[PDB]
Design a protein around this ligand. Structure first.
Ligand code: 1PH
Length: 254
C-alpha cells in the first residue's frame, strides 16, 4: 500500500485492481481522497517494438479525449525509461467479468450497452484506428455507461472466440463488426457462436469454413436477430459496417 508520484501530484495505493504481463492496475487516492485508477507498466524487459506499441496507444488515447465520452478518461500520464504511470478514471467492473456474473441481461440494458459499444468503435474508426482484437475485456462500466479502455495497438494480458475469419486467413474496419457481433450474440443467447466447439483447432476451422451454419434461435426482438445475422457474415464484403449499424432499426426504433 505504497505511494505513487505522477507529475508532482501524490497518490496513495488503496487496492490492486489487476495485474498482467509487466502491467498492473491500482485503485488510488489523491490528497483530497478522490478516487482514480493508475496503470503501472514495467519497461525494463520491453524492446523497441513493444515500446513503440505503448507510445502509440498513449498518444491515440490522449488525442481521443473531448472527441467522445465512450473512451476512458486519461487525466495525466508519466513516461520514463523504466516505467509508465497512467492516471485514469476509476470504473465499476469490466464487461467480461460483468457478463460472466450476470444470469440474464435486460433487453433495454443489452440495447444501451450495444449503442455505447458501436459509438466507441465508430470513434476509433473515424481516427483511422482498427482494433482487430475486440473482446468484452476491452470495455469498462463507468458512470452508468460502457467505455473502451484499449485500442489493441499494444500487446496486453474469451480466448479465440471473438477472432474474425479475415484475421485467421491472414497468415479492414469490418473486422471489428464480427467481434462486436459475437459480444451481442453472447448478450442474446448466453453463449458465444463457437463456444460449444471446445477444441481450439476445430474452433478456428468452424469460423473460416463456409456452410458451417451458425444457429440463430427465434426471439421476440426480430430487429436484434437481424443485427446478429448481418454482423456474423464470413465474407467481409457482405458484412454490415459500423455506420450502417448505427442506422439499423435495433438502435434507432423504440
Ligand atoms: N471497481 S474497481 O475499482 O474494482 C475496477 C474494476 C475493473 C476495472 C477498473 C478500472 N477502472 N479504470 C480502469 C482503467 C484501466 C483498466 N484496465 C487496463 O488497463 C487493462 C489491464 C488490466 C489488468 C492488468 C493490466 C492491464 C481498468 C480500470 C476498476
Amino acid at each position: 500500500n505504497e505511494c505513487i508520484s505522477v507529475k508532482g501530484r501524490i497518490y496513495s495505493i488503496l487496492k490492486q485492481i489487476g495485474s498482467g504481463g509487466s502491467s498492473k492496475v491500482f485503485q488510488v487516492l489523491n490528497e483530497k481522497k478522490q478516487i482514480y485508477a493508475i496503470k503501472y507498466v514495467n519497461l525494463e524487459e520491453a524492446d523497441n517494438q513493444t515500446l513503440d506499441s505503448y507510445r502509440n496507444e498513449i498518444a491515440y488515447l490522449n488525442k481521443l479525449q473531448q472527441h467522445s465520452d465512450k473512451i476512458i478518461r486519461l487525466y495525466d500520464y508519466e513516461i520514463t525509461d523504466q516505467y509508465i504511470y497512467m492516471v485514469m478514471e476509476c470504473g465499476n467492473i469490466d464487461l467480461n467479468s460483468w457478463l460472466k456474473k450476470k444470469k440474464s441481461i435486460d433487453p433495454w440494458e443489452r440495447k444501451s450497452y450495444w449503442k455505447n459499444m458501436l459509438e466507441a468503435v465508430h470513434t476509433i474508426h473515424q481516427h483511422g484506428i482498427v482494433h482487430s482484437d475486440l473482446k468484452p475485456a476491452n470495455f469498462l462500466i463507468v458512470d452508468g455507461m460502457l467505455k473502451l479502455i484499449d485500442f489493441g495497438i499494444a500487446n496486453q494480458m474469451g480466448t479465440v472466440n471473438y477472432m474474425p475469419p479475415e484475421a485467421i486467413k491472414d497468415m479492414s474496419p469490418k473486422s471489428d463488426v464480427w467481434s462486436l457481433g459475437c459480444i451481442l450474440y453472447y448478450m442474446t443467447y448466453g453463449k458465444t457462436p463457437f463456444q460449444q466447439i471446445i477444441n481450439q483447432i476445430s474452433k478456428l476451422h468452424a469460423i473460416i469454413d463456409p456452410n458451417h451454419e451458425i444457429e440463430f434461435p427465434d426471439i421476440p426482438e426480430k430487429d436484434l436477430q437481424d443485427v446478429l445475422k448481418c454482423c456474423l457474415k464470413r465474407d467481409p464484403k457482405q458484412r454490415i459496417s459500423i455506420p450502417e449499424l448505427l442506422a439499423h432499426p435495433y438502435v434507432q426504433i423504440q
